[PDB]
Design a binder for this molecule. Structure first.
Ligand SMILES: *[C@@H]1O[C@H](CO)[C@@H](O[C@@H]2O[C@H](CO)[C@@H](O)[C@H](O)[C@H]2NC(C)=O)[C@H](O)[C@H]1NC(C)=O
Ligand SMILES: *[C@@H]1O[C@H](CO)[C@@H](O[C@@H]2O[C@H](CO)[C@@H](O)[C@H](O)[C@H]2NC(C)=O)[C@H](O)[C@H]1NC(C)=O
Ligand SMILES: *[C@@H]1O[C@H](CO)[C@@H](O)[C@H](O)[C@H]1NC(C)=O
Lengths: 55, 49, 6
């Protein structure tokens, strides 16, 4: 998918149909540091095991 | 944007897209060199046509 | 869930 912004918040959507969802560690992957990519944007990635599911 | 499009064409041959965002300047340089090589193997008397 | 019942 693609990262998009509605002006204020940041979502991830598929490419041929607009359907925005919340950026978690399940629909992204990690590779590298924040100094090689040209155009990287500061936001936050949600961890879907820490709302309350700390037992 | 053009780099985001190049990343999807990389994704379409089996390479991940962080490979393109890491090596972006080197890839743009290699493309520019190859286009420059085309335009002077055409200007010489090598009859390719 | 039925492993992280720490
Ligand atoms: C961008 O998206 C966010 C999230 O969908 C919008 O925030 C929501 O706005 C509605 C108002 O219609 C509220 O009822 C929700 O509670 C808001 N969500 C959150 C998490 O606060 C935001 O308004 C959108 N901005 C624009 C310009 O469309
Ligand atoms: C994106 O976020 C990082 C931190 O998460 C920012 O890095 C900080 O940049 C300021 C000024 O450039 C420094 O004073 C801080 O010390 C930096 N923090 C760290 C931990 O090194 C970065 O500048 C942000 N980028 C943008 C465009 O806002
Ligand atoms: C878009 O272009 C501006 C200059 O007009 C540049 O500062 C910015 O980093 C670019 N954004 C990208 C490459 O995501």
């Amino acid at each position: 998918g693609v990262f998009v912004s509605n002006g204020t918040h940041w979502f991830v959507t598929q490419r041929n149909f607009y359907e925005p969802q919340i950026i978690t560690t399940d629909n992204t992957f990690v590779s590298g540091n924040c100094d090689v990519v040209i155009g990287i944007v500061n936001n936050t990635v949600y961890d879907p095991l820490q709302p309350e599911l700390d037992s | 944007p053009f780099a985001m499009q190049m990343a999807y064409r990389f994704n379409g041959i089996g390479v991940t897209q962080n490979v393109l965002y890491e090596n972006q300047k080197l890839i743009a340089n290699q493309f520019n060199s190859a286009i420059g090589k085309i335009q002077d193997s055409l200007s010489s008397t090598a009859s390719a046509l």
